[PDB]
Structure 1
């Protein structure tokens, strides 16, 4: 994948989500939670000021909010998911925003990037990959 810009500011609405179930299962998220969440549309709001990100990902079930500074390791406590601690680090690879979440689970993290007018997010855990695509609702520019 390739990002067309590093500017991810805006509000984005999920248009597709594939293998979210597998990703959730890899995280040991319980059956009932997976069934509720799997096909609920998510909205993602990104407020990005240089290296500082505040993100909110919302549905009518749960929200999944995380704030970070690019290039600064942090203790991510995953209360909205599996209630674990990971050492999270978000870096740029080109114009792809890459997060590695070090901890118990292998190969855990995500990659987020813009292609033109859409936002893409690939979430990984173990041997599972979830691919999400979001259409634009609002961007500043």
Structure 2
């Protein structure tokens, strides 16, 4: 159909970087842009168009059941394939991400009004704290 009216949210983006490089867009702009998603609003009246495009941060969703392994594609980071398995150790939620990187996984737990997250890959550990809203 020719009727392009609506709000449209990006779901896939292939070779955005090669296209941007052809436009001589700088190295830093290319790498940051290729991770963003976009929203296009198209306002169309016959053959007349008013278009609006805006970058947005991608939402990165993951669903799982404790004790049931699942395939995870780490699009929020390095976009690798891992086989992820989440277990309870007491009240600590523990995830092992089996794949190319050794000793990769995370631990997540609630203490008080705070969520604690420890991210591990190899010999590097990232430690994060979140406040409840």
TM-score bucket (shorter structure): 0.5 to 0.7
Residues 92 and 64 of structure 1: is their aligned pair in 2 closer, same or farther, counting only changes over 3 Å? same
1:57 to partner: Cα distance: 23
* Cα distance, 1:65 vs structure 2: 1.8
With 92-101 and 31-40 compared, the bigger mean Cα shift is at 31-40
CA contact (8 A) 1:54 1:66 kept: no
Give the total of aligned pairs. 133
Instruction: Write the deviation string for residues 40-97 of structure 1: whole angstroms up to 9, x where unpaired.
Output: 9999999999999999999963433211000001111112221211010000000000
SS of residue in 1 equivalent to 2:37: coil
Task: Give CA-to-partner distance per residue, 1:102-134, whole Å, 9 cap, x none.
Answer: 000011110000001110000111111110100
Question: What is the match of residue 105 of structure 1?
Answer: 101
RMSD over aligned CA atoms reads: 15.4
Whose strand fraction is larger, Structure 1's or Structure 2's? 2
Give the gaps of 5 or more residues in structure 1: none
SS of the residue corresponding to residue 89 of structure 1 reads: strand
CA distance in 1, matches of 2:118, 2:62: 16
4+ residue segments displaced more than 2 Å: 5-64
Q: Return the structure number with greater relative CO, CA threshold 8 A, min gap 6.
A: 1
Tell me the TM-score normalized by structure 2.
0.58
Higher deviation after alignment, 83-92 or 21-30: 21-30
Unaligned ranges ≥5, structure 2: none
Per the normalisation by structure 1, the TM-score is 0.55
Higher Cα Rg, which structure: 2
Indicate how the Cα distance of structure 1 residues 98 and 38 shifts in structure 2: closer, same or farther if over 3 A, else same: farther
**Partner Cα distance (1:76, 1:55) in 2:** 35
CA contact (8 A) 1:113 1:121 kept: yes
